[PDB]
Amino acid sequence: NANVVVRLLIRRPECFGPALRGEGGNGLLAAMEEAIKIAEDPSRDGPS
Amino acid sequence: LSYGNGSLHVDAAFQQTLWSVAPISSGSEAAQGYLIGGDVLRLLHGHMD
Structure with a gap:
């Protein structure tokens, strides 16, 4: 199951999100810091 | 065949x-x-000369 899942995920790289996708996607650390900032700042975390 | 760069590449x-x-x-x-x-090849004109 692990091998099959890894193969499918690498066949479809969009599953990793905006980051980790490449071609302009930032690193995992940058994505996590950006998400922390988004959570801290309203009007980007909630609906408003 | 990758078009991502300005030129076409093979990767x-x-x-x-x-x-x-x-x-x-x-x-x-x-x-x-x-x-x-x-x-x-070589193009020879005369008698191999």
């Missing part, structure tokens, strides 16, 4: 591109001599 990626295979020469290779396309 081993998880995206697949279709390659068409065309033949140049086969294993028959009839006898010797018998000038074949894409050969390196």
Whole structure:
């Protein structure tokens, strides 16, 4: 199951999100810091 | 075949591109001599001189 899942995920790289996708996607650390900032700042975390 | 760069590149990626295979020469290779396309040769004018 692990091998099959890894193969499918690498066949479809969009599953990793905006980051980790490449071609302009930032690193995992940058994505996590950006998400922390988004959570801290309203009007980007909630609906408003 | 990657178009990402300004020029076209060939890279081993998880995206697949279709390659068409065309033949140049086969294993028959009839006898010797018998000038074949894409050969390196010398053009001699006189009596091998």
